[PDB]
Amino acid sequence: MEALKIALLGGGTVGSAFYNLVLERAEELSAFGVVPRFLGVLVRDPRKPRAIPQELLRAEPFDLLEADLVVEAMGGVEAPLRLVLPALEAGIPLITANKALLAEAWESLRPFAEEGLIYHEASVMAGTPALSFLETLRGSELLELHGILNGTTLYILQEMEKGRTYAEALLEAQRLGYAEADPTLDVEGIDAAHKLTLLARLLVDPGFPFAEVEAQGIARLTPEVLQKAEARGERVRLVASLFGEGGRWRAAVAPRRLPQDHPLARARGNALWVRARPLGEAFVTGPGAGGGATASGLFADLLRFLSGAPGHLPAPRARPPLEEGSPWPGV
Amino acid sequence: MEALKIALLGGGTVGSAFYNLVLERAEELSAFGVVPRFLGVLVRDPRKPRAIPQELLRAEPFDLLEADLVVEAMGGVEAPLRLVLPALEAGIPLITANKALLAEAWESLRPFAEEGLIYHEASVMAGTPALSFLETLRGSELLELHGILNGTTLYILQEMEKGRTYAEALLEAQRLGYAEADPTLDVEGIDAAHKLTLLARLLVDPGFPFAEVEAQGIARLTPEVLQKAEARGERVRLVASLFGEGGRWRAAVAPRRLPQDHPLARARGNALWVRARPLGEAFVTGPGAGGGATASGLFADLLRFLSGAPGHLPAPRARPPLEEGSPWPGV
Ligand SMILES: [Mg+2]
Ligand SMILES: [Mg+2]
Ligand SMILES: [Mg+2]
Ligand SMILES: [Mg+2]
Description:
Radius of gyration of chain A: 20 Å
Protein name (chains A, B): Homoserine dehydrogenase
Largest interface: A-B, 58 and 57 residues
Order of helices and strands of chain A: EHHEEEHEHHEHEHHHHEHEEHEEH
Keywords (chains A, B): Amino-acid biosynthesis, Metal-binding, Methionine biosynthesis, NADP, Nucleotide-binding, Oxidoreductase, Threonine biosynthesis
Helix content of chain A: 25-40%
Number of domains of chain A: 2
CATH topology of the largest domain in chain A: Rossmann fold
CATH superfamily of the largest domain in chain A: NAD(P)-binding Rossmann-like Domain
Distance between the termini of chain A: 57 Å
Bound molecules: magnesium ion
Shape of chain A: globular
Active site (chains A, B): 195
Region (Disordered) (chains A, B): 313-331
Family (chains A, B): Belongs to the homoserine dehydrogenase family.
Oligomer: homodimer
């Protein structure tokens, strides 16, 4: 029974949920001949009440080179990047939920992702199978991809449809744990843009640039706009789309008017929908945010690592779209 | 570079679709440093019209030991079993869509599956992500699982739903090739039982016996029974359930009255619904049968193999249900 040394970067909601999940599920790890042992837990706020042993709290960066795995969920881009690089360079895998880091620091991280060292199922739709879903979709050639990827904006739009104001909805989303103190990334559609970029890279273009995604949020939406849409038998949702145009892949995030019965319009939780040849049309749904939900994704990748499987690999090569896609009508 | 030698067992609808899909996307495999070549295709009778070159057809078993991969979609149990064992024993991976073989010949196949030599995403819900979906769900502990796994009975109920009699619906399912001349396996819920058994082994009990799955088919269903259901706001579907009962796992297939709003009742294609802790509720749906759909799943596994990832592994150990469940009412 050798130890599975884990260096955890981030003691927030997600990090805490993950730490506790690993210890709670220790017997599942035993089936693999290992017992989990955390080298330390880096925390931004060492005084915030936590369910992590005091002796493991680290207010300052610590040596990660002796870890078997580095798990990161601290948000932000530059600091996490500088912290994980040394480990990745040492050949230590990185399990992360940081969609911002992967989307904006791909120039530095791609090389390691290319050699299967980065596991990031939790980076898109939390623990819901989004990346593994596309890995299986590789059996076909993508025709079009559309998803409602942000938990906060989805909740807000759902609540406004019920008559709740933008503000009441947002504050509740924060109380519920879906959104952070400053949900600006979420409501401006940037978080969805981060995730869409990750999906594009795994399926059609390993070097897809985050800067090419055109993104807009829900800031102009009101209960009035949503009720008028309902009157026409449509639902408004912030959709992240990947489709062909002029022979090149185009990615955009924007509110779209969807038929009320469309899978994306009637989904429970966030959702990813695709049309591919020859499979056809398929889609997956589940929670897109939350401490427990995200922890499930990180733990899923830890088990994937223990099984001997590589991390999530970028698409083998860039491939053009098989057909021009027709975007949904914008709001 | 190297060659990717493939021995194909089954030249039917799936076999033919897989053969042509590999040829259509062969150049793509160069990204993995390989060039695909089929060593031969085992078929019942090479005299029949087939979209595979006559010269590649083999009417009698042929040596498989030079193959890099054996792909099988013959249907049946004992014949396929005796043909693939020699390859597996020699360390050659098996990519199969044969849920019957895996469900009923597990005693012989499990050891190889444990070694990561068996890839069978296409054995459940065709190319739609089902096994990969559950692999990610491993991040949580299963509360309950319910799926509509058989394409034939889904089509049948969707039609009887519209007012078609059982015989009328079945005939069309057959006339369109969804159901065989003798649809027994499908309509008695055995195919669903096979697939449910596979899902159970991957997620909660590597030794789950097919013999313990309690299956009931469509025999007691009529268009009227469905009207009664429609009147009460429900839909009837043949559901494969895995839930806790008495602190042990119970697996059953049977027609169920689902609230019409439920993801399972709304699904146009086959579907898998799950509730787990701490993830919550997740759902995946897509085509569950068909040549192209199944080929997509087989090809997805070929890509998984080329990436250095092992096949689908059985649960690392058996573990009891965390909570007591109970399927919807039956008929
Ligand atoms: Mg995910
Ligand atoms: Mg690559
Ligand atoms: Mg070889
Ligand atoms: Mg499948």
